[PDB]
Amino acid sequence: LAIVKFLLQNSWQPADISARDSVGNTVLHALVEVADNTVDNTKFVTSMYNEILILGAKLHPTLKLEEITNRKGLTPLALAASSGKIGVLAYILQREIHEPECRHLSRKFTEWAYGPVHSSLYDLSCIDTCEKNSVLEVIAYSSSETPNRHDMLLVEPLNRLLQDKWDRFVKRIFYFNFFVYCLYMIIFTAAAYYRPVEGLPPYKLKNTVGDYFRVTGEILSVSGGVYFFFRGIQYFLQRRPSVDSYSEILFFVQSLFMLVSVVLYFSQRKEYVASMVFSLAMGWTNMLYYTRGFQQMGIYAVMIEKMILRDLCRFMFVYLVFLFGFSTAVVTLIEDGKYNSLYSTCLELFKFTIGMGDLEFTENYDFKAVFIILLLAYVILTYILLLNMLIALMGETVNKIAQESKNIWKLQRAITILDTEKSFLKCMRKAXXXXXXXXXXX
Amino acid sequence: QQMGIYAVMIEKMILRDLCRFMFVYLVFLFGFSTAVVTLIEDGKYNSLYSTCLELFKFTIGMGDLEFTENYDFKAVFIILLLAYVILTYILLLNMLIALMGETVNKIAQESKNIWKLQRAITILDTEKSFLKCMRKAXXXXXXXXXXX
């Protein structure tokens, strides 16, 4: 500090308090860069930051220091948030200083208090910074290819601000989106459910009522399909080039699958359904995304997705190896009867895992019981040896993450809300924060 | 107080579980079952209801795998199954155990007093609901801790 002071205050050459380094960073930017999220780190950066501002306002009052952008277009705050420097982010947004010349510097003020009671007011730059970035918006995206980034959004101003929108306008908006989506699903299934059997379909359609109703559905479903593809492409354009967004990746997959089906049908190839069936299944499951976040439903939604990302690579592969090895061992074993085919035998081996295992299904073959011991091991060995260790890791986390995660849903609502307003046409919307408070402390 | 703990937990889970979970399972089963009905032209596995029921058995432990011969596109239906069978009972199951395990870090311990409330309500009502018949209506506790 003393040397910071002597640099800025000396008779010989006072430091230019707003100079930018090669990267565009000022002392406030550099301080943000030097934070490492440890408690004593925050503490020292936080008040040295404070000190710089106090000196800015004392010595050169006209200078709006916290507005100065580094090369990449980032204010100190926005850098903090881009690099998951959370303690400091919280410090910069939270701080209010009362001094002569104090008001220009301070982030927030407390308007009034009652013997009990307290009120806090927040500026708030992050919410209103539409033009380049919003503390939320950097936070809002949020790819969070890091554990730490999720933590930041929390309580101080951003977390409450997000909660506040949802009651006023946004949740009402979300339900209509969900309801609108739901009808799209009933229609896609309905046409698919009621599609005509006759071969070389249709070819051509529209006789009687039923024909008219089904045809509208088929057109409506494809049209429904285009919307995702168009929406999808825009997201690809925005976050290019980068799983940060599994739901985002999916919806696009489902829409595309529908498109392939449409491309095929006009072609009139018979299989095309192999495309429509996939498109229908992908859609209903994607219904899972929509609920978020109940906060009861939401927790359930997050966990399944996390496990699926984790589980298949570690586990789907290992199970495949155990099943693959044993199934191959069996095919060799049997001369004839269609259980020779790797595919039939492997499928027969799968049933043991489902709960439908047939044990010694096949009479055909040689060497008697060895095949059964071969089975007992695989049946004993893979579903069962494999299963115990698979439960255990979850149990060990279930020592922990479940508790860490719930905030994880919180991020999802924020991203959905942030996008709709941005993705809502940036239509007229709010753009003062304060929290009613009452703790004594008195 | 042994039976009681068991009684409270099931009721709590049932209130919690069906809305979070019965609905999600229904969605996974509903989606895949619909995908299957589309797949099959004829044979009574076309009906949403028969096909969905066939899909349920996988969850029970009675799953038939490729039950139906009827249809088109071969193996895709099986992959369609493997996913659902792999995907829902199993992907769904792991996360469902885990939340309970996380609580089972905790609530079981908090709860037992929860039964306590139930006995109190039963007792309070019978006397009130017992005709407010003549009944007691001094408390002191024998004590001995030193503290000396």
Curated annotation (Swiss-Prot), chain B:
Na(+) 1 binds at G61. The chain crosses the membrane at residues 13-40, 76-104. Changing K57E: Restored channel activity. Changing E66Q: Minor modification of pore attributes. It comes from the Eukaryota. Residues 102-130 are annotated as: AD. Residues 68-75 are extracellular. The modification Phosphothreonine is found at T122. Ca(2+) binds at D64. It is found in: Postsynaptic cell membrane; Cell projection, Dendritic spine membrane; Cell membrane. Residues 1-12 are cytoplasmic. Phosphorylation by CAMKII seems to regulate binding to vanilloids. Phosphorylated and modulated by PRKCE, PRKCM and probably PRKCZ. Dephosphorylation by calcineurin seems to lead to receptor desensitization and phosphorylation by CAMKII recovers activity. Changing E54K: Abolishes channel activity. Restored channel activity. Changing E69Q: Minor modification of pore attributes. A motif (Selectivity filter) lies at residues 61-64. Residues 45-67 dip into the membrane without crossing it. Homotetramer. Interacts with PIRT. May also form a heteromeric channel with TRPV3. Interacts with CALM, PRKCM and CSK. Interacts with PRKCG and NTRK1, probably by forming a trimeric complex. Interacts with the Scolopendra mutilans RhTx toxin. Interacts with the spider Tau-theraphotoxin-Hs1a. Interacts with TMEM100. Interacts with PACS2. The association domain (AD) is necessary for self-association. This is Transient receptor potential cation channel subfamily V member 1. It comes from Rattus norvegicus (Rat). The lineage of its organism: Eukaryota, Metazoa, Chordata, Craniata, Vertebrata. The gene is Trpv1. The chain holds residues 560 to 719 of 838 of the full protein.
